[model samples]
Target: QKTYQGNYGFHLGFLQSGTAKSVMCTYSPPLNKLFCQLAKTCPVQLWVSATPPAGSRVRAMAIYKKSQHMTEVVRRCPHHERCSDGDGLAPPQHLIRVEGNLYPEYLEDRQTFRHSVVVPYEPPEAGSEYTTIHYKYMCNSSCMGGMNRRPILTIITLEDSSGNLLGRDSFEVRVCACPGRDRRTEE
Candidate 1:
């Protein structure tokens, strides 16, 4: 169990051995109204949990937030192969920012864009080399132009057989513009 006391309200999180994750929030008086209003502004969902699973460790975690060209050659393509680099395992409480661009390519008609992302990290177990996670983003003509910025958030976790959290990490992939197109021009 964990309790977060914020300025406007309190968020209480509880975790059981094999139950669904849950969170409860309470605000002081009219501040509760403000919380409800803000919740409508974003489509992203926030995840809350108590702790990592038993007997598991967090070796390392990283965040890659950048834009890369479509033509840029990548040794490890998420579409074709696994993205793990066989790096060493991460230690507990390790955090780092991975410097790389999210690759974006224009489609056949040159109107739609497809983005591919592969995040590599080490697992909690010792002697483990590395593991990779993948994500894909697509935008149509309507979402193109000046509104091409797409936010990607990746939360990776290791869970037990009973659905208990053993370890977890999160990575954010920032918006990457397609090659030969200046996002500012569309604005």
Candidate 2:
């Protein structure tokens, strides 16, 4: 297992700066070689906000392909205002959202509670030469203190139709703090 950690920086706007803390572990067990070609052929990018809406779970996932073209299927989120063509791209691909909880102590660097949303697999379209799948994983927190300093991890796994492991990869989500207006304003 190889351990990786770092902080990624991004600008939410003129006055806002966002940072993401990430940790990754890579493992090789001979089985991962089978999907090495698929992993290389289909590159993944997870997009997140430094300062996402307060009290809302941050959204992140790969929306493009290796060619830098946006995947029609991955652009079907209601929050994605840019990709609304109404071309039946509503559901994108077959994805099921699986939610799980993580202990606050799991991540040593930060004091926060973590909840996860995992989308496991993407199946290829019938008769298509190549099938590209986009999976999304989200980490949500309700604590006001750590709103600006949240940690998230996204893991991708490729498997055969028979559920055999093919390959695996992981990435981190970097986000900044929400602006004052975006926070709750007491009426």
Candidate 3:
């Protein structure tokens, strides 16, 4: 597998909102037009556009797949939320931006095995790499469904072993907000 590096982010060029002429349902921003070309040999991470900034209110999540040129929503993986009670019992949102590449061998070895994302977030003074996050705000207000949301694409800067950003590879993750639906809500 060839190693690649550059500015990578989510590409929404392939998403179809099914609602024709429905302004309320159009994709806020096309993914493809949003980011640069994908690194055919690399993998990307997942991200979600959430609201209430921290806990519980978060809605939807999305990831960019190069092969299909589409974004896949990981339904099982609910968006990470901050603790509502401020008890700090749950895991902290891994808010630190990270960057890395994907390996082909691993992709073929796992089932439902999604792409591998390289996350590199550390202190610069401690000899770490810096990541660039390009975030997009979705609806100005919460959607009718009661979910406040936004979209973000983190394009981690590719660095050499010594921490030098090499404009070589890039990957992106896109997130959206959706109304929380349950048995009661469905009715």
| Angstrom error at residue 51, model 3 | 40
Model 2: runs farther than 4 Å from truth?
1-150, 175-187
| Model 3 Cα shift for residue 114 (angstroms) | 25
Off by over 4 Å in 1: 1-128, 139-150, 179-187
RMSD (Å) per prediction: 17.6, 19.1, 17.8
Per-residue lDDT over 1-187 for candidate 1, one digit per residue giving the tens place of the 0 to 100 score: 1122222121211111111122111111211110111011111111323423344321221222235432322121232123232223311112121222132111121333222222322232354223222222222111333123332233344444353444444433222332112222222
**Using alpha carbons, what is the TM-score of model 2?**
0.25
TM agreement with the true structure for every prediction: 0.24, 0.25, 0.25
Go through the candidates in order and give each one's C-alpha lDDT.
0.25, 0.25, 0.25
Tens-digit lDDT track of model 2 for 71-187: 222212233223332223223221212222131111111232222223333222465323233322221122122222232233343333443433434433222122121222200
Error of 2 at 138 (Å): 5.5
lDDT of 3 by residue, 50-137 (tens): 1112111101122333434234322111232222221232122222211231211111115543232233322223332332222222
